[PDB]
């Protein structure tokens, strides 16, 4: 957690307002940039659930603002990937489709390199970490294959932490960081400021980022607070 990415979930052209209701993604982005945000994580919920697409609003955000944008949601074939890229996104994440299309994903990693992160959702079951795909396999085999295909970056999600007050699963994340040369984005379960700090502790093993939604919007801490608290570790 070197770097922190606030999450923005877009539907019908709108995102959750950081209060003190819903507004434009631009407003959200401006409100997050105010606070030291250098990267934003955007979810296109309409594309993720086949209801539509918000690509042109995304392209407006990258046009209007000079902020790095990670973009995810419904990226599953060449047509969706293109339209994701056409947005101006600094980086794009591919989830389930990556496990279900091993050759397609190698092919895209080959063409796009650092523009591609693979988002892996995992579930622990009967003592084994299984890619909660659509299944998708054993976590460790999946990682090795993806690593071998040149994947630059993974986004790892323990599918339980979404309930927020467990903590993120640091023992898994550290294991994943040790298993691949590709840097890791922790996602899912941020509850407290000290959760961010437990992660940043391990930035040198390869956990260099965290995505954070709820904890931020439910005012558990502020972004400026977390960015400085991670600075305080740096030194």
Strand/helix succession: EEEHEHHEHEHHEEHEHEHEHH
What's the architecture, going by CATH? Alpha-Beta Barrel
Number of domains: 1
What percentage of the residues does DSSP assign to strands (E)?
Answer: 15-25%
Biggest β-sheet: count, sense, barrel? 8 strands, parallel, barrel
PDB class: isomerase
Keywords: isomerase, (beta-alpha)8-barrel, evolution of substrate specificity, histidine biosynthesis
Assembly: monomeric
Entry title: CRYSTAL STRUCTURE OF subHisA from the thermophile Corynebacterium efficiens
Which descriptors apply to this entry?
monomer; about 240 residues; alpha/beta; TIM Barrel; 8-stranded parallel beta barrel; two-stranded antiparallel ribbon; isomerase; (beta-alpha)8-barrel; metabolism; evolution of substrate specificity
Summarize the structure.
This protein has about 240 residues and is an alpha/beta fold.
SSE layout and pairing:
Layout: E1 3-10, E2 15-16, E3 22-23, H1 25-34, E4 39-44, H2 45-48, H3 55-64, E5 68-72, H4 78-85, E6 91-94, H5 97-100, H6 102-112, E7 116-125, E8 128-131, H7 139-148, E9 154-158, H8 170-179, E10 184-187, H9 193-200, E11 207-212, H10 214-217, H11 223-234
Parallel strand pairs: 1-4, 1-11, 4-5, 5-6, 6-7, 7-9, 9-10, 10-11
Antiparallel strand pairs: 2-3, 7-8
Helix pairs in contact: 9-11
